[PDB]
Amino acid sequence: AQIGPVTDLHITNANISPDGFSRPAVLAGGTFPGPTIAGNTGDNFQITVFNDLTDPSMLTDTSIHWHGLFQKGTNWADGPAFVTQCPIITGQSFDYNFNVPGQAGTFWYHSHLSTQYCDGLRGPFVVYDPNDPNASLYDVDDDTTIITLADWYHTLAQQEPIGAAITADATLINGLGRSFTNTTASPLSVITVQSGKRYRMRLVSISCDPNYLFSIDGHDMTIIEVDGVNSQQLTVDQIQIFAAQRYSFVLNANQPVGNYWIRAQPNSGGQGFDGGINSAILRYEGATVEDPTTTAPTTFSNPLVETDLHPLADLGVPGQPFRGGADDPLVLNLAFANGRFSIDGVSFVPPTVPVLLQILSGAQNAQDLLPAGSVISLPSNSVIEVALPAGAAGGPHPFHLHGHNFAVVQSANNATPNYVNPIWRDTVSIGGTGDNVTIRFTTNNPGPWFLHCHIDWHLEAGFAIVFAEDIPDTASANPVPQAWSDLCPAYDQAHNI
């Protein structure tokens, strides 16, 4: 029941009750989470998105981002509203037609208009590798081995009151889970395994906000992929996974036939597992159909620490092995005050004309681009370093860069940089007060690429900038289809702009 790489995808409103509480939602493919979109490395995806939304309480416009896919030469298909396109209006459709050369791994898709993905438009996106170097580590890798972690809110995203704290009402694992308050014994998700087999579990955070402490009672987890990047095998018994991150791990079904709790503890909202909140079930074939009776340890033996991860391939680190050892070394001042986030003193407010369209129309330096102060040019064919020192309220903030993955030269909670063999990924926690999480990449992908905190509430409140990478080559690199050119006139007509 995976769809793609060529598929329609209808975006609708419907009622759902994933924790026993009914509310309206914004859904892809009629379900929460949406159906898995899948193909093989190098495939041409043609995802024709039909906007059938009618309920303005969750916005009737939409735009979809394919998280972690580089979109080289297809910046117009990336999805962030007012960065690479105007939204699709209701009753219209749009073909996101792109290729995935050189990528294979676990991704996801989500609305990238306002906080709409929180209202339900989120699902997995898997690019399989027919020649996967990790293939011999497991037996089973299919739709039944994808594990999504989601925060779910009873209050609609657009209706979250100004000046009140936002927390979720349930953790959903594979779309099901129980509410933190007024808990009812609604169905839990079951992940089924066969004793003796090995599974590539593809763990996807589709969170709007919390990070999760993920574990499986009685089991350990051997990480083999991080945000699309193959890793050396790293065995852990708990994974702290931040919004929008992905891991693949090998699960060896090597415990007695039985039932085992799957745990996903968010950093906000309900604490613990009373009444079966924050829980799913790992069930072995032949086990009794009943809840697990297992318990977690008080202290985990081998939690994931990001500096323990290393690429499977020899990826290195571009630039020179010291702070500022890049062609374009940046240090961002990341701040929060009075309900708004800012980067270098500027709070992101989406522009009327998408950044890409501004560039195609001839705006040719970043000082000419709107929003003023929110668009930073990057030079072509250059090593970029971005230091992201933490401290802003609401952390730990998982920062994400479109169009690229990056070397994590410095991770949370550890002052030592790694210029030799750090993991590469696309979403990274910037940690806690005094940290200096730092990323590096090379600019080989012309176009405007969003950089933002992936806590969606923080993005909405301004925690973003756009890197206008290689402005001079953006138009030649990214020819645009007529349907894309039609988006802004249709949107602005519908909204009387």
Ligand SMILES: *[C@@H]1O[C@H](CO)[C@@H](O[C@@H]2O[C@H](CO)[C@@H](O)[C@H](O)[C@H]2NC(C)=O)[C@H](O)[C@H]1NC(C)=O
């Ligand atoms: C994080 O690392 C960056 C460099 O990657 C530091 O930036 C330097 O900051 C000082 C002022 O604090 C400037 O004088 C330097 O020009 C900056 N660049 C360098 C040394 O390469 C930054 O201070 C670090 N931040 C924290 C909080 O540790």
Ligand SMILES: *[C@@H]1O[C@H](CO)[C@@H](O[C@@H]2O[C@H](CO)[C@@H](O)[C@H](O)[C@H]2NC(C)=O)[C@H](O)[C@H]1NC(C)=O
């Ligand atoms: C803090 O981060 C550093 C840098 O990633 C880690 O240092 C590496 O540790 C490994 C394992 O012992 C050594 O092989 C490397 O040579 C170290 N690299 C550097 C540059 O020092 C360190 O382990 C991390 N600290 C903790 C507690 O995990």
Ligand SMILES: [Cu+2]
């Ligand atoms: Cu994303």
Ligand SMILES: [Cu+2]
């Ligand atoms: Cu993205």
Ligand SMILES: [Cu+2]
């Ligand atoms: Cu944030």
Ligand SMILES: [Cu+2]
């Ligand atoms: Cu984004």
Ligand SMILES: [F-]
């Ligand atoms: F992305």
